[PDB]
Amino acid sequence: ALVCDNGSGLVKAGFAGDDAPRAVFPSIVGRPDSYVGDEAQSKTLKYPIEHGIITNWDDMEKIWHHTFYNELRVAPEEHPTLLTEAPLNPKANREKMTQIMFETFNVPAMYVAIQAVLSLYASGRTTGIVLDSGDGVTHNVPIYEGYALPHAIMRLDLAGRDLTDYLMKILTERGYSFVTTAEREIVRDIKEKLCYVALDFENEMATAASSSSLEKSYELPDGQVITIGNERFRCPETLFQPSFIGMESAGIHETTYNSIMKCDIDIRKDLYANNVMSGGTTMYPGIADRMQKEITALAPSTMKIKIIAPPERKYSVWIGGSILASLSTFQQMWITKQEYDEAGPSIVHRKC
Ligand SMILES: CC1=C(O)[C@@](O)([C@@H]2C[C@H]3OC(=O)[C@H](C)[C@@H]4CCC[C@@]5(CC[C@H](O5)[C@H](O)[C@@]5(C)CC(=O)[C@H](O5)[C@H]5C[C@]6(C)CC[C@](O5)(O6)[C@H]5CC[C@](C)(C[C@H](C)/C=C(C)/C=C/[C@H]3O2)O5)O4)OCC1
Ligand SMILES: Nc1ncnc2c1ncn2[C@@H]1O[C@H](COP(=O)(O)OP(=O)(O)OP(=O)(O)O)[C@@H](O)[C@H]1O
Ligand SMILES: C/C1=C/C(=O)O[C@@H]2C[C@@H](CC[C@H](C)/C=C\CC1)O[C@@](O)([C@@H]1CSC(=O)N1)C2
Ligand SMILES: [Ca+2]
Ligand SMILES: [Ca+2]
Numbered sequence: 001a002l003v004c005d006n007g008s009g010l011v012k013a014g015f016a017g018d019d020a021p022r023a024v025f026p027s028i029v030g031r032p033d034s035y036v037g038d039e040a041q042s043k044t045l046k047y048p049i050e051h052g053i054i055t056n057w058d059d060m061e062k063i064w065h066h067t068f069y070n071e072l073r074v075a076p077e078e079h080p081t082l083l084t085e086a087p088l089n090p091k092a093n094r095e096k097m098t099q100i101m102f103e104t105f106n107v108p109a110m111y112v113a114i115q116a117v118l119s120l121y122a123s124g125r126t127t128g129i130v131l132d133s134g135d136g137v138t139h140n141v142p143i144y145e146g147y148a149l150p151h152a153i154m155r156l157d158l159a160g161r162d163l164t165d166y167l168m169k170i171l172t173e174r175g176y177s178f179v180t181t182a183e184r185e186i187v188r189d190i191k192e193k194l195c196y197v198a199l200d201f202e203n204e205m206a207t208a209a210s211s212s213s214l215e216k217s218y219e220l221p222d223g224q225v226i227t228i229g230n231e232r233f234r235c236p237e238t239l240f241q242p243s244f245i246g247m248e249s250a251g252i253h254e255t256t257y258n259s260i261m262k263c264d265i266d267i268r269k270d271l272y273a274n275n276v277m278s279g280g281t282t283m284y285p286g287i288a289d290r291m292q293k294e295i296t297a298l299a300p301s302t303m304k305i306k307i308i309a310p311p312e313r314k315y316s317v318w319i320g321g322s323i324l325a326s327l328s329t330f331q332q333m334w335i336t337k338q339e340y341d342e343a344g345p346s347i348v349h350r351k352c
Contacts, residue, residue, distance in 0.1 A: 002016070008052055022071065026038065048057060052134070079107070087153045088139070088153055098347065111175075112348065115261050129275050134279040134280055138281065139154065151263035154250075156247075156255060165245075195233065208230035216228050257295060276308045279317075282309065333351070
């Protein structure tokens with residue numbers, strides 16, 4: 001079976017039963033008659049997925065064909081294919097993915113799983129609450145015995161690309177100039193290399209104000225060496241206080257809490273003890289300790305709280321897919337070509 005995890009920024013693709021994706025490449029299509037993903041990267045670019053939701057279907061077909069043919073070297077008509085989706089995904093989109101897989105790619109079998117749920121599986125759990133934060137969107141997804149609890153899911157627009165754009169803004173306020181699309185990629189690299197989550201925002205602002213102890217240098221492609229100081233932790237602080245970029249949302253600690261509070265009292269303790277971090281935007285050093293501190297301050301004083309931050313969490317959605325698609329007991333769960341022929345795209349609602 002194939003496993004394809006389509007993100008707003010990065011596609012992760014490979015074979016069920018493997019420990020890691022074979023291909024990780026940008027979720028882009030480029031035109032000057034069109035180039036896809038890593039081919040487009042080597043050369044106007046469009047992202048077919050926005051905030052985790054597929055919005056350009058023709059370009060999404062290009063991404064999928066590139067995945068099957070170029071990245072995995074397979075004919076999709078010969079492999080059951082597991083795909084992933086956002087924890088909240090419009091009904092019409094679920095049908096269109098299904099329609100395309102059966103009618104365009106002629107897959108023999110298909111299934112679509114919620115991204116955050118797969119990450120939980122990759123951590124060795126069937127119960128817990130996942131914070132999955134990527135390039136385009138963030139969700140909190142409470143999960144009991146393998147199944148997301150849809151009424152308790154929380155969503156934030158805020159994710160990694162917004163964090164990059166904010167780092168550009170505050171570095172520009174410092175006296176640099178980061179405004180172009182190329183500069184966006186440079187600042188993404190700065191973010192990934194040098195940013196971290198402060199345990200206490202104010203305390204670290206004070207250290208940065210009165211000393212150079214938190215400063216790091218970065219050699220730009222153009223040869224200027226810049227210095228990054230409080231920007232290192234101000235950038236990801238936005239996750240905890242979205243008002244830094246004018247967003248009204250609760251921060252990720254409060255959305256975690258709010259999600260747990262919408263669940264049955266009998267499972268809340270299990271959720272609090274199994275907070276699993278997923279996605280590239282959870283990679284900041286310090287994030288687990290900060291989450292622990294913030295959730296402790298919101299939760300009952302008696303509550304046992306644990307934040308799990310798997311080292312492999314850039315790829316845990318994919319790994320979870322690999323685990324699920326290669327389970328013997330999953331064999332009966334696939335949507336078959338016959339089922340699709342009889343029920344149409346609407347089959348996805350009954351089976352996934
Ligand atoms: C099995 C299967 C389905 O459950 C599902 O196909 C679900 C069921 C449908 O839910 C639905 O028709 C409903 C959405 C669904 C059904 C049951 C309960 C519920 C789930 C969560 C909750 O109410 C409510 O939206 C919350 C409290 C969560 C939240 O963060 C805020 O409101 C805010 C903030 C914000 C920043 C502003 C608004 C949003 O919520 O974002 C979310 C909520 C919806 C959306 C507009 C984003 C998109 C593009 C998704 C839509 C329209 C999804 C529709 C459906 O997805 O953004 O909504 O998803 C994938 C898997
Ligand atoms: N070490 C790091 N520190 C901070 N951010 C990082 C790090 N590594 C990757 N990221 C960010 O993670 C994001 C990519 O993560 P991921 O692959 O989980 O997202 P996606 O699946 O493409 O998007 P989404 O899930 O939002 O649709 C990018 O914004 C990237 O800059
Ligand atoms: C190395 C890498 C990282 C990434 O996450 O890439 C995804 C994919 C990408 C598409 C445009 C880019 C020119 C191509 C490849 C870069 C891929 O845009 C992102 O970099 C966007 C733009 S800045 C940011 O933080 N996210 C994230
Ligand atoms: Ca993702
Ligand atoms: Ca706020």
